[PDB]
Amino acid sequence: ELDKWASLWNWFNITNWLWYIK
């Protein structure tokens, strides 16, 4: 689809930390 967004989410590795929401 587009590697322009996958490059940023890499910097946003915190979203993994997001498991603390549930």
Description:
The protein has helices at residues 3-11, 14-17. It has 22 residues and is an all-alpha fold. The longest helix has 9 residues, at 3-11. The radius of gyration is 10 Å and the shape is elongated.
Task: Summarize the helices and strands and which ones pair or pack.
Blueprint: H1 3-11, H2 14-17
PDB class: viral protein
Keywords: kinked helix, viral protein
Assembly: monomeric
Task: Jot down its keywords.
monomer, 22 residues, mainly alpha, 2 helices, elongated, Transmembrane protein gp41
Number of separate strands: 0
Integer-rounded radius of gyration: 10 Å
Tell me the structural class.
Answer: mainly alpha
Strand % is under 5%
Order of helices and strands: HH
Shape, per Cα inertia axes: elongated
**Span of the ends, CA to CA:** 29 Å
What is the number of helical segments per DSSP (H or I, 4+ residues)? 2
- State the oligomer: monomer
Q: How would you characterize the largest beta sheet?
A: none
Helix amount, in percent?
A: 55-70%
Brief description of this entry?
With 22 residues, the protein is mainly alpha-helical. The chain has helices spanning 3-11, 14-17.
